[PDB]
Amino acid sequence: NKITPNLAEFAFSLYRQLAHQSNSTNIFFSPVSIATAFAMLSLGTKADTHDEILEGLNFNLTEIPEAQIHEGFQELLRTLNQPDSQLQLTTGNGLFLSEGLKLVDKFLEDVKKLYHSEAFTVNFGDTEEAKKQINDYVEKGTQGKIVDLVKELDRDTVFALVNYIFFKGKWERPFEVKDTEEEDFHVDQVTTVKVPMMKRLGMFNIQHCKKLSSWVLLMKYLGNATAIFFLPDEGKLQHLENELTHDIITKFLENEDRRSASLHLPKLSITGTYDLKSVLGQLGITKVFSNGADLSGVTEEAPLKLSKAVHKAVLTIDEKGTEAAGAMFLEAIPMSIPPEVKFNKPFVFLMIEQNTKSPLFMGKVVNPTQ
Questions:
Q1: Where does the record place the modification Phosphoserine?
Q2: Are 120 and 197 part of one and the same domain?
């Protein structure tokens, strides 16, 4: 889809920002989930406020018309929220505005029947009630997986945006629980930690790429997405982070050559919690969060600004994220001895949706127990 390049540039911009902030913490976020939310918010903005957001999502407004942009997110939201989607994706957007504001019907209509998002009116005068009825909406939304999300609300708040996403994928070619063993993970060159290490001898889309100095592994999920893992050579993590591009990711997805390997991949569970006011502020999106915000598409008369914007992303990697099977296959291993390739030191990853080539997720594992 025609907005995919911009989505990919946004993914990297945000990742590089986060990888600059801290180099000692796990990173996990949805580029799609955040862009989509701020695209939607942009429908209620005008002029500088509006342009700042779309430019902050890596769109050049002197090259791409706004219709394409939105029809792009539309198309992408259509293919993500299919009824018959085997993809374990629980995504949601909460808009919370102080009651007493006369809200534009069209903005509430555009939000709901174009971006599938929830827009609520609450009394921000009571911090506990508002905070509980925000965290309660994420309780229902995530089937019960994300609780007590919003830690604090400052009194001046009039408008909060809450962006959540939970993913627990089922491998097309799963591991066997019986083969998972506790093993070392190297968090630095002299230090190890114990992790459940998943293990399978089989045929993988796995290759060492000299340009990126990295092992590159792609594994497909049920539903149509692909996990790609990059394991840098010693000292080559940052080189790896700098050299990633969309065309490269694209090139790896195009090739379905398989080779013999003994793979080690940690079973893992990670969450990234991000303050998007802070984080997107660093990428050029400040006006919509400040007193000068033109939110007249949300409300015509009264001054309004987005007080609070939160992103929470949750990921489980395991042997296969469902307890019932049915699919039976069989990979042929050749007689020759297979390389052992262990994902037992810091690595970078992405989940790419197959129809659009969109980056559903990006992240880095520095320490699986962190």
A1: 336
A2: no
Distance CA 334, CA 316 (A): 32
Residue 139 shares a structural domain with residue 278: yes
Structural domain total, the chain: 2
For residues 53-83, one letter each, b for 16 or more C-beta atoms within 10 angstroms of the residue's C-beta and e for the rest, the string is: bbebbbbeeeebeeeebbebbeebbebbeee
Angle at 248 between CA 244 and CA 252, to 5 degrees: 125
Separation of first and last alpha carbons in the chain: 36
Place of tokens 């695209």: 39
289 phi-psi bin (left φ>0, alpha ψ -120 to 50, beta other):
alpha
Method: X-ray
CATH of the domain at 325: 2.30.39.10
What is the chain's Cα-based Rg? 21
Q: Are residues 222 and 276 in the same domain?
A: no
**Residue type at 329 in one-letter notation:** F
| Residue 144 φ/ψ region, left for φ over 0, alpha for ψ in the -120 to 50 degree band, beta for the rest | left
Is there a contact between 57 and 6 (Cβ–Cβ < 8 Å)? Answer: yes
Nearest to 356 by CA among 70, 35, 73: 73
Phi/psi of residue 25, each to 5°? -120, 140
In a shared domain, residues 93 and 6: yes
